């Protein structure tokens with residue numbers, strides 16, 4: 002019966018090695034190219050701003066694919082303030098596209 | 110080829126049918142303001158000597174470690190994303206439909222990755238219509254990109270099925286008029302009257318009504 | 324690790340190099356296709372032009388049997404080679420359905436008399452009979 006305990010710990014170790022592996026391949030959303038592929042975590046900018054205009058008029062293949070997601074989801078991802086951008090990140094999965102300085106107001 | 114080809118040839122002055130809003134469908138015929146909403150989604154299936162034995166239990170451990178890892182590494186489909194990153198499922202849509210028209214002429218990253226899979230496999234993963242779409246899901250491993258109102262009707266009927274993922278896009282069902290008729294606007298005021306009296310959503314539970322499975 | 328199964332599995336890697344018969348129907352198809360999987364395959368063969376486009380089907384056999392190379396034949400001449408030589412296999416499936424045809428000049432008067440001579444030739448059952456006289460390459464599993 003001690004040999005039967007020797008097998009049930011091996012399947013427990015194999016189950017534990019399976020779960021510890023898959024959570025250590027997982028990289029969170031670091032960069033824009035890490036953010037350009039996934040369509041779950043949705044994007045957004047201030048509607049009629051310098052950031053919205055830049056993604057519309059860029060030729061970079063990473064940034065042109067990001068514009069196609071925001072143009073398709075138009076009425077729900079382009080909020081109209083920087084304030085509603087804070088509300089939608091604090092709620093469900095959303096990566097808002099601010100300028101660099103107004104980050105450090107919010108991230109402090 | 111099909112509906113709109115007959116409409117621009119001025120055959121069948123009305124079309125009434127599942128004609129959907131697509132920008133290329135609006136350029137050659139001005140078909141009417143829609144009666145019911147639309148969104149493409151996936152219709153994948155709802156699922157179902159002490160050292161000598163020491164090497165053996167370490168051999169069975171690592172092989173069971175790897176087998177459960179790759180299985181856990183394999184993702185269950187709950188989106189169009191993981192459906193696009195997995196070439197084991199051989200997903201497709203209606204050939205020459207508004208669905209494949211959408212995945213072709215869109216430039217978003219994941220759906221262009223879905224069109225790269227379907228264009229390599231134009232012979233196999235494409236179907237003739239939704240009936241060929243339903244049967245290839247139920248028999249083989251497949252995930253079909255039918256539009257919205259055919260999704261809930263078949264999932265009420267076939268409880269082996271489910272809807273995977275939300276609305277990929279948003280459309281409606283219009284009515285085809287040849288090139289843009291003055292009779293089109295008579296229909297537009299009419300549909301606003303027919304939905305106001307509720308008979309739109311009264312015939313709703315008359316014809317879908319497939320009793321579901323909780 | 325998955326080996327090179329399909330063309331989309333073969334479209335990404337630039338180590339395992341590609342190749343077709345230079346000035347053939349397969350080389351012309353990849354040049355004049357709009358599929359994003361097949362257009363990226365043409366950019367690799369156009370860039371490596373003087374080394375990947377061999378000029379025969381015979382040198383295509385030599386370059387697969389040597390270093391890492393995935394040659395792009397038609398579907399039938401696979402089964403001559405993948406039964407004469409059991410070191411080579413058909414990875415993938417049919418990329419595009421084509422058809423061999425007796426070529427006559429433009430507006431040739433003989434074209435309508437070859438077509439009837441072919442549609443009689445398979446109803447007599449000899450396009451299948453002449454088939455299994457040359458494709459029986461020893462039956463190598």
Ligand SMILES: *[C@@H]1O[C@H](CO)[C@@H](O)[C@H](O)[C@H]1NC(C)=O
Nearest residue numbers: 154155156157247248269270
């Ligand atoms: C149940 O699982 C088997 C394989 O385990 C599969 O072949 C079958 O299709 C599943 N049942 C349904 C209704 O999909």
Ligand SMILES: *[C@@H]1O[C@H](CO)[C@@H](O)[C@H](O)[C@H]1NC(C)=O
Nearest residue numbers: 244246247248267268269270
């Ligand atoms: C659907 O499910 C029923 C039982 O719920 C089963 O008898 C039938 O074979 C299934 N149809 C399929 C898998 O096509």
Ligand SMILES: *[C@@H]1O[C@H](CO)[C@@H](O)[C@H](O)[C@H]1NC(C)=O
Nearest residue numbers: 388389407408409410411463
């Ligand atoms: C090729 O196939 C032949 C016939 O089976 C075999 O003898 C040979 O070892 C294979 N490999 C090489 C490098 O020739």
Ligand SMILES: N[C@@H](CCC(=O)O)C(=O)O
Nearest residue numbers: 047050051052098099100
């Ligand atoms: N500073 C930006 C607005 C903020 C943003 O779009 O990130 C502008 O001038 O449009």
Ligand SMILES: N[C@@H](CCC(=O)O)C(=O)O
Nearest residue numbers: 127129203206207255256
């Ligand atoms: N509504 C589609 C047909 C159904 C589908 O492709 O999902 C069309 O107009 O082509």
Ligand SMILES: N[C@@H](CCC(=O)O)C(=O)O
Nearest residue numbers: 344347348349395396397
């Ligand atoms: N049958 C082809 C040649 C072989 C190939 O290119 O695969 C042709 O007519 O060009």
